[PDB]
C-alpha cells in the first residue's frame, strides 16, 4: 500500500488533526465556518499593519492595515462560495454538500470579519 | 601500409590535409601580396 511513515501515520498527529474545526464532525457547518474564520481573520491583520504602505504613519497604520485585512477576508469568502457552487452540483459529513458549504462560506465571512475587528480592538 | 594509406584516405583526414593546404596557399598569397582589394 502507501508508504507508511510516522508523519502520515502517528497517534499524536492524528489526535491533533481530529480536534481541528475542519475535521471535527458533529458540528454544524456554519459554526465550523465561524471558528475557522475567526482564527484566520485575527492573524490576517498582522502583516498588513506592520508592512503596509502606511505602516510608518502613527495612527493611520492600524486603521489602514486592518481595513485591508477585512477586504481580503471578503475576497476569500467569495472564493469559498464559488468553490461550493462548482464542486457540489448534484458525502458522510454535511459540510461536503451544496447546502453545507454555502452555510460554511457564510460563517467564514462573519467569523473572519469579526476576527479582523477583534484584532483592531486589541491595538486600540 | 595499405591499410594505413587507406586510413589517410578517410574523409576527416583528407579534409584536414586539403584545408591545411588550401589555407596555407591563401595565407602565403597574402604574405607576398598584402592587402589585395582590387584586381588592378
Amino acid at each position: 500500500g502507501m508508504l507508511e511513515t510516522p508523519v502520515t501515520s502517528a497517534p499524536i498527529v492524528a489526535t491533533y488533526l481530529s480536534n481541528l474545526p475542519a475535521y471535527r464532525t458533529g458540528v454544524a457547518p456554519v459554526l465550523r465556518g465561524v471558528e475557522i474564520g475567526l482564527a484566520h481573520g485575527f492573524l490576517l491583520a498582522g502583516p498588513f499593519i506592520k508592512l503596509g504602505p502606511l505602516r510608518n504613519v502613527p495612527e493611520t497604520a492600524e486603521i489602514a492595515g486592518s481595513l485591508s485585512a477585512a477586504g481580503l477576508v471578503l475576497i476569500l469568502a467569495l472564493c469559498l462560495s464559488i468553490y461550493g457552487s462548482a464542486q457540489f452540483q448534484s458525502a458522510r459529513d454535511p459540510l461536503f454538500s451544496a447546502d453545507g458549504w454555502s452555510e460554511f462560506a457564510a460563517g467564514f465571512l462573519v467569523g473572519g470579519e469579526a476576527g479582523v475587528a477583534w484584532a483592531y480592538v486589541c491595538t486600540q | 601500409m595499405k591499410d594505413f594509406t587507406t586510413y589517410l584516405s578517410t574523409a576527416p583526414v583528407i579534409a584536414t590535409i586539403w584545408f591545411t593546404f588550401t589555407a596555407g596557399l591563401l595565407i602565403e598569397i597574402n604574405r607576398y601580396f598584402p592587402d589585395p582589394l582590387v584586381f588592378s
Binding site: - | D3, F4, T6, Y7, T10
Partner: protein, 67 residues
C-alpha cells in the same frame, strides 16, 4: 580470501592499421557502413560508449584504463 596480485593477459590484441580503415568496427550496428548521413553522427556519438560495445566487464575495464 583472494590474494591481491598482479594479473594480466599477454598480447590480448594485435597492433594493426586494418581497423583504422574500417570505421564503426567497434559496434555491430555501424560495422556495415553508411547508407544515410545519420551513420556518420552515430559513429562519433558511440565511439567512447564502451559499455554498449561489449557486455564483458573485463573488456570494458581495459579500454577505460588505456583511454
Amino acid at each position: 580470501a583472494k590474494k591481491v596480485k598482479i594479473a594480466v593477459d599477454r598480447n590480448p590484441v594485435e597492433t594493426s592499421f586494418e581497423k583504422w580503415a574500417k570505421p564503426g568496427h567497434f559496434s555491430r550496428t555501424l560495422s556495415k557502413g553508411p547508407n544515410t548521413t545519420t551513420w556518420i553522427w552515430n559513429l562519433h556519438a558511440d565511439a567512447h560508449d564502451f559499455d554498449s560495445h561489449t557486455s564483458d566487464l573485463e573488456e570494458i575495464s581495459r579500454k577505460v584504463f588505456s583511454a
